[PDB]
Ligand binder design. Structure first.
Ligand code: EAH
Ligand code: PR
Length: 232
């Protein structure tokens, strides 16, 4: 759609409006990086692996009643890509779409002497989020607080939201401060709501799916009619 004509509460500019430009903050060697089919599958795979483990009742975390298999969203991905071109993690830009009224977003910054391959950047972000299982409590799951803590849970808690139905990421790499740098941004179809459950508890995993998936046995299939625009 036309993002310059899709308003949002707060009336902030939309990340998607106008022509794509690289931010000055990107220095003078920025390059946007295409997440190819294998990159999108790896991302989907890791996010669905962990959703399946958690919904199972892993880490004493409660069992999940209706946690869905996630799909890639090209629209979210475009907005993510476009966001990385600003070379900055946090902005007040709007990023809503017609389908996903309040998309969550995660940003993974990298800084080092050398630039790792795209796959290595993704595994870094996967590793970072995975490492928060040492931080996420069932308390957090019953009643989302982001801080907390100690310590950080936002990344992992967003990957296991049962309101989330779709993800889309983008990547820009550049050079500044004598370091190779990268911003990896993932937009999600939904977001965790402060004070509300990350996902709804059950006795059996997926006991509330119309249809459980055949690969991620503890999750609802791709066609589960979850509303990503309602919170828990
Ligand atoms: C672009 C990356 C998006 C990051 C989203 C945030 C967190 C997802 C993080 C980790 C997923 C890890 C999967 C690990 C292996 C799999 O067997 C999961 C179970 C391992 C375990 O139970 O500790
Ligand atoms: Pr292509």
């Amino acid at each position: 759609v036309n993002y310059c004509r899709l308003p949002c509460r707060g009336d902030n500019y939309h990340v998607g409006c106008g022509e794509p430009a690289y931010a000055q903050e990107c220095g003078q060697s920025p390059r946007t990086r295409e997440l190819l089919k294998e990159h999108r599958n790896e991302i989907l795979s890791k996010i669905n692996d962990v959703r399946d483990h958690v919904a199972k009742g892993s880490w004493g975390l409660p069992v999940a009643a209706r946690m869905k298999v996630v799909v890639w969203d090209a629209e979210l991905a475009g907005l993510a890509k476009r966001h990385t071109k600003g070379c900055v993690g946090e902005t007040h830009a709007c990023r809503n779409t017609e389908r996903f009224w309040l998309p969550g977003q995660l940003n993974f910054k990298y800084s080092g002497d050398k630039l790792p391959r795209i796959k290595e950047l993704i595994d870094d972000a996967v590793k970072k989020g995975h490492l928060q299982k040492h931080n996420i409590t069932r308390e957090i799951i019953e009643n989302y607080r982001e801080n907390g803590p100690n310590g950080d849970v936002k990344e992992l808690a967003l990957a296991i939201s049962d309101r989330v139905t779709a993800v889309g990421c983008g990547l820009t790499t550049w050079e500044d401060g004598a370091k190779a740098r990268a911003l990896l941004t993932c937009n999600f179809s939904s977001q965790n709501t402060r004070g509300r459950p990350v996902y709804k508890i059950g006795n059996s995993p997926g006991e509330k799916c119309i249809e459980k998936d055949e690969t991620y046995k503890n999750l609802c299939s791709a066609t589960e009619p979850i509303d990503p625009n309602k919170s828990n």
